[PDB]
Amino acid sequence: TLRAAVFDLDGVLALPAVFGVLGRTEEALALPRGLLNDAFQKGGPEGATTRLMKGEITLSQWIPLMEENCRKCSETAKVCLPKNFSIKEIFDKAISARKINRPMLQAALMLRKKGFTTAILTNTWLDDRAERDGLAQLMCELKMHFDFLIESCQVGMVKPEPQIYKFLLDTLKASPSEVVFLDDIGANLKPARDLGMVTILVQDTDTALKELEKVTGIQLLNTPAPLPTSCNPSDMSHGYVTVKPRVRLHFVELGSGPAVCLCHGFPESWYSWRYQIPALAQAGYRVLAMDMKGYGESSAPPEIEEYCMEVLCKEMVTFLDKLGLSQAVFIGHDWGGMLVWYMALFYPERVRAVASLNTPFIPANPNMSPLESIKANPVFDYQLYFQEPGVAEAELEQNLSRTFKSLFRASDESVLSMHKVCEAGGLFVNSPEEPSLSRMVTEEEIQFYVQQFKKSGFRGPLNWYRNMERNWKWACKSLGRKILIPALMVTAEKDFVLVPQMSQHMEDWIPHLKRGHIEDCGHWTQMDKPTEVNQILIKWLDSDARN
Amino acid sequence: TLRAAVFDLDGVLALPAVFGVLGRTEEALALPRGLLNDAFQKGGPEGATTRLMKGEITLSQWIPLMEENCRKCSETAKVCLPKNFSIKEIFDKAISARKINRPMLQAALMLRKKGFTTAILTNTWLDDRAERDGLAQLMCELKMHFDFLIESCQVGMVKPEPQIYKFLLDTLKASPSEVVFLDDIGANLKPARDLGMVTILVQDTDTALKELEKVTGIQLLNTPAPLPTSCNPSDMSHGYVTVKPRVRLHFVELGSGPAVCLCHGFPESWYSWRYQIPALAQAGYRVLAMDMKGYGESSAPPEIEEYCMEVLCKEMVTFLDKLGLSQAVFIGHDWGGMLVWYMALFYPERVRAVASLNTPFIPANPNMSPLESIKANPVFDYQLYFQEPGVAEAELEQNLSRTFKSLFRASDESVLSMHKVCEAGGLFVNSPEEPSLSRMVTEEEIQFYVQQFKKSGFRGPLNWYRNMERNWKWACKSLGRKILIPALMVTAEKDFVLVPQMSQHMEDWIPHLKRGHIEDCGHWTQMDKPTEVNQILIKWLDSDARN
Ligand SMILES: O=C(O)CCCCCCNC(=O)NC1CCCCC1
Numbered sequence A, B: 001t002l003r004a005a006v007f008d009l010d011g012v013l014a015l016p017a018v019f020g021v022l023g024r025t026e027e028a029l030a031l032p033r034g035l036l037n038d039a040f041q042k043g044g045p046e047g048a049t050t051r052l053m054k055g056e057i058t059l060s061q062w063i064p065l066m067e068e069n070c071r072k073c074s075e076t077a078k079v080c081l082p083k084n085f086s087i088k089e090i091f092d093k094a095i096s097a098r099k100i101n102r103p104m105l106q107a108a109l110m111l112r113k114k115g116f117t118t119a120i121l122t123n124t125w126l127d128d129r130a131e132r133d134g135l136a137q138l139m140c141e142l143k144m145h146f147d148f149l150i151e152s153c154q155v156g157m158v159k160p161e162p163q164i165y166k167f168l169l170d171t172l173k174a175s176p177s178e179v180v181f182l183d184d185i186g187a188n189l190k191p192a193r194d195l196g197m198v199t200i201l202v203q204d205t206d207t208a209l210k211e212l213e214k215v216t217g218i219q220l221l222n223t224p225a226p227l228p229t230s231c232n233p234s235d236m237s238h239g240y241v242t243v244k245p246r247v248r249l250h251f252v253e254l255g256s257g258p259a260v261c262l263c264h265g266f267p268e269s270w271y272s273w274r275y276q277i278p279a280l281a282q283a284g285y286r287v288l289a290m291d292m293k294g295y296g297e298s299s300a301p302p303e304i305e306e307y308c309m310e311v312l313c314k315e316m317v318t319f320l321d322k323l324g325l326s327q328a329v330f331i332g333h334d335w336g337g338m339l340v341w342y343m344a345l346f347y348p349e350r351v352r353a354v355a356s357l358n359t360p361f362i363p364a365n366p367n368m369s370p371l372e373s374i375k376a377n378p379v380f381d382y383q384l385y386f387q388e389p390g391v392a393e394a395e396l397e398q399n400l401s402r403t404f405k406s407l408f409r410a411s412d413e414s415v416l417s418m419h420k421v422c423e424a425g426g427l428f429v430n431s432p433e434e435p436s437l438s439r440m441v442t443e444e445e446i447q448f449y450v451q452q453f454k455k456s457g458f459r460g461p462l463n464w465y466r467n468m469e470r471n472w473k474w475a476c477k478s479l480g481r482k483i484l485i486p487a488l489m490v491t492a493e494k495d496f497v498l499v500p501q502m503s504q505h506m507e508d509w510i511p512h513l514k515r516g517h518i519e520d521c522g523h524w525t526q527m528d529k530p531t532e533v534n535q536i537l538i539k540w541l542d543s544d545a546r547n
């Protein structure tokens, strides 16, 4: 019958419980047991700590007051304090040491995923310390995961007072009988129990989760490895930069730090990075997930030349120019991958670091024309099929839903065959009309791509495949160069078009090139293995792009 | 007859001329005169330097080659090199030492302001050094100031070759007879002169400008102190964050670094920061110039409560949340100023630093109601006039152009009288129908505000003045607090509504408060004194908000 889960912060979703430091500072400084705890609660309701918890005074105003309480509390047990005693020192250390109890957050997230209304009910303070940013960031991450965040210092209500509970019940629009309350402080449980709501005294996460699991009848403990945070398109910050007359690029922006520009491939969207955007951001980066020219909310001019690599790159440079960015780490996938490689080859000054997924850097053959080269590779047949304007457009557009359900599939789900399409007459010639639902995408997500492409269609996207002669000539100018800025190539085992083997000779043009490999990963890397990707990129950014 | 100005980079818009370092490294290292210069041009057209200048090889590939040339050039004059000789060492130092020759840039900008088509024609290289970002940033700033930037390493054409010149003439769509070419290298002047175009051998900036001034017949030297860079609305990056259902805030974003959120007052726009956005960005900040709720492209819901300070602040917090920002320096003006003060009082954790222009922080009088307080101040009469919904809306909306031309005026231009409006019956009762053109705003700019307000009107904006009772109560909760995070108050002498005197007791609630004062500055601070403002804020950010 439960339908709401409320989690305590310090001691439930965050550990080590700040305040739980008092006890340690005593056993450490060999002070009388509880001394610092009695000072922390000196005065009870009228106490400085309760005022601080209600929002009457800021943390910085409180610190001095708690110090006074550590002078009057010790004044009574004979006892004196160390020459270097500092409440700020003790708390700054305590707060930053406190981290998100991941297992609890996971339980929280799960419950939310199955219908529950989650909320954080905590006794906190207005933090104006010079290190406040620490708490801020931790709050930034947690917040987005709960429907509600009830902070005492914000409502002026602190709990064991039953009023904050009524407030909670009201904020939740739920009755006691259907609410679970997790807290590491017994007292704060009494008022909850009294209104008639399930309470869990949280000591060790696992036991609490055990009790929570039982009471909710939902698998929380020993649950499979969850998917990284995906982002809701409507909650994202959307940006629009006009890089040329009637050519504006749309992008999603999240987080702060070095600018990391993500460039999706064909036929995708900024949405194809729905998994790494929150991660890279959380990792300390300003993620700029693009809508490459031709897709979604970005301009999709009809002309082919508008999509030759040179014009595409210049625009990206202008994009940086307009945004007031001198550099950006360029991370591309598929056609996007190709784009970033040339960004590093023609605009190193603007690329802090470059990284590609699946797409390897392969210099142009000054002798053989692209068309010929590609004709010499069975798996690259479809590219010839995309040459004739209109042809590919018609089929890929006939049924958008079908197209994406047919494309976005894991290694072991294929329903197509990129080899022999010119012969078959089309990409879906012998593909089901109603393709099954891939394990990588939800019906909702596919529908996002469908709605995106309902704007500009596949002309713009397909044109990226119609400038090989031009790209070839352009690239030939870079044959004497070498990518010497930080570069990271990430191969996908199960990608049968952009095979890992195609990248083997890359160290020749990119000497310091770093690598990454993902097993059982198909072409749609980001979707297929978001966890490993985020892992691989975050590790690479922190080492070769942050400095 | 001239109509185009082309400036050389190294040695014309940038100094000290990199390469001009060779000569110094010789006299410094007591090397044979010219030794390093002969190595830098070892091979002429076929030389490593010419390949580097054409884009064939990157700078990092060149460095090794120039070193070889410093071994073979010294191999001939008997001579050997120091144990610690490094071409990278010499160049990294040279490039970063090179700075924008401001006087030249000013001449460039002026000419552009008077009809000329300006362009930078330079022999440069693809910079992939680990310090490349240096050049990048300098290029980022210059670029935006010229219609064209012709880089040799990008066109594969380097100059004294006459071809790059034809390219130039073509890029300019202008004939030789109407082009001026500034360069510190005689040789590069010959090809220009030969096509029949005015050339200026630039040695010392002033003499060159003297010659340029003469040949163009335009005052370039000893010109008045120019206005800071203003930004073109259509070239700005526009962002939209939905903070609540059917409530999305629009903002302009530029630059990278600590996030600095700018909050305009009544009745303005993000455009009111058109002067500090490029500056603060150039200063190393990520400027987020807002469109405060109720204005421009931001949502303007009809209800009054939607604009009480509490709701306004919560939304700003959500704005940060959505953008993945844990903190932001909040700089507000007028009503915006008020907003940031309360952001620091209720969300210190999110405010890296707070700064207000004109608007002082004055705690709520727990006894007297706002309405009464304001009735006790003649100059605050209009605020009572803004109370009745519809009233103020009708007048301010009757003639938008008139309204803004009537409002946006410097201290010595007033055409109104904020004292006695309830009596007069309106704000413009005895104001000209066709107000003159203020020295602060161009007809075009006023028209921007006019077009902005044609969307939501003055209801939303006016509502900011209709929640005093609510704001009062809210603020009373903060009476026991103190702004202890970095704060900077900036007063305006000639502001007769938000007078400097109203801020005198601010140190009481903001102990570490820093200040700034601008003379002969009216209420519309940003417009009135952009130079001093940018100066004051940049100085404050670099000291109290960067760390
Ligand atoms: O090989 C070459 O010489 C040039 C290659 C340019 C390659 C772009 C490669 N990416 C795709 O083709 N993705 C397809 C994967 C399958 C579904 C459609 C998009």
Ligand SMILES: O=C(O)CCCCCCNC(=O)NC1CCCCC1
Pocket (backbone or CB within 6 Å): B265, B266, B267, B334, B335, B338, B370, B373, B374, B380, B407, B418, B497, B498, B523
């Ligand atoms: O004084 C108080 O008690 C509360 C004050 C809230 C004040 C907002 C002040 N800013 C303006 O009024 N600007 C007007 C300047 C003149 C043109 C119209 C906007």
Ligand SMILES: [Mg+2]
Pocket (backbone or CB within 6 Å): A008, A009, A010, A011, A012, A183, A184, A185
């Ligand atoms: Mg607790």
Ligand SMILES: [Mg+2]
Pocket (backbone or CB within 6 Å): B008, B009, B010, B011, B012, B183, B184, B185
């Ligand atoms: Mg020169």
